[PDB]
């Protein structure tokens, strides 16, 4: 009874709207993934938080070389 506007139809994202045993098979499945990516990315925050100083560091060295050029021009 779906090929008619009078016959009722369903929405998008209604499986988790019921609250059955597929809505809790999916609410828990998402926590068993996005809890273990939360410590792949909590461990690599030691490195890249030092790398953003290393990039800044890189820039600093570059700018000091330019200064050096100007200082030699003056000389």
């Amino acid at each position: 009874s779906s090929d008619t506007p009078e016959g009722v139809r369903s929405g998008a994202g209604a499986v988790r709207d019921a609250g059955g045993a597929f809505g809790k098979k999916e609410q828990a499945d998402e926590e068993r993934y996005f809890r273990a990516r939360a410590r792949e990315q909590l461990a690599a925050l030691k490195k890249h938080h030092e790398n953003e100083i290393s990039h800044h560091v890189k820039e600093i060295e570059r700018l000091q070389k330019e200064i050096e050029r100007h200082k030699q021009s003056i000389k």
């Binding site: 809790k24 098979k25 828990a28 926590e31 068993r32 809890r35 273990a36």
Partner: protein, 254 residues
């Protein structure tokens, strides 16, 4: 009591039978029916009752009057006419279910849905320490512990947390007509959240509890009297309990 100083408590068992005595009594007086032949003012029937449950100020006497209305519902449906009219008069609820009762959680309280406007959070000072962390460790459990079909293995990642729940779920079960005290509650809850039970088996924690509880009332009576008197679990009181659970765990099963 309440208008003279003291503190009262009142249970209505139940309030779905004070409504069908109003539907019948006021149909034979020729009053026109509303929904489900209930009268117009069934909301006014329950509301003028449940607002006397006050808490007076201290320049009147300071007395209180709690109320615990019971409501029976049909087929566990909470969206009926007389349920929803009395959900929205009370500060908080305790949702008792059937699949909790039969799986084994007895008292069958849905601790997920049993919301409560906490009442200015007058839990008590020591229970705030151990059940503050318990509330979050159980909430962490319920998001992640509903598969019943496993394919992958993450014992360092997930299986440590869900082992803290079943030790705290099977701790929460109780008997009947034997209610505990609050410092006998702080002791048994201390041993669950502080990791001192993850080397048991969950089919032995209900056996672990009564052997623990009989040991502390008998041999450690001056310990529990410093939790009830001082209110809090102090840092030196944290020290003394650290041995007692481990001394008993050294010789529990032998």
């Amino acid at each position: 009591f309440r208008d003279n100083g003291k503190h009262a408590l009142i249970i209505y068992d139940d309030l779905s039978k004070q409504a069908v005595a109003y539907r019948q009594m006021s149909l034979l007086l020729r009053r026109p029916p509303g929904r489900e032949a209930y009268p117009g003012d069934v909301f006014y029937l329950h509301s003028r009752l449940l607002e006397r449950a006050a808490k007076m100020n201290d320049a009147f006497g300071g007395g209180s009057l709690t109320a615990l209305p019971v409501i029976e519902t049909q087929a566990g449906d909470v969206s009926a006419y007389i349920p929803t009219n009395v959900i929205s008069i009370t500060d908080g609820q305790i949702f008792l279910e059937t699949e909790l009762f039969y799986k084994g959680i007895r008292p069958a309280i849905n601790v997920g849905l049993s919301v409560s406007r906490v009442g200015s959070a007058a839990q008590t000072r020591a229970m705030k320490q151990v059940a503050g962390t318990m509330k979050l460790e159980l909430a962490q459990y319920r998001e992640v512990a509903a598969f019943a079909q496993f394919g992958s293995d993450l014992d360092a990642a997930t299986q440590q947390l869900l082992s803290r729940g079943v030790r705290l779920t099977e701790l929460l079960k109780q008997g009947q007509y034997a209610p505990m005290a609050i410092e006998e509650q702080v002791a048994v809850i201390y041993a669950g959240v502080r990791g001192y039970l993850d080397k048991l088996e969950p089919s032995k924690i209900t056996k672990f509890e009564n052997a623990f509880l009989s040991h502390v009332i008998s041999q450690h009576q001056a310990l529990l009297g410093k939790i009830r008197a001082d209110g809090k679990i102090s840092e030196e009181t944290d020290a003394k309990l650290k041995e007692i659970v481990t001394n008993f765990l050294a010789g529990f099963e032998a």
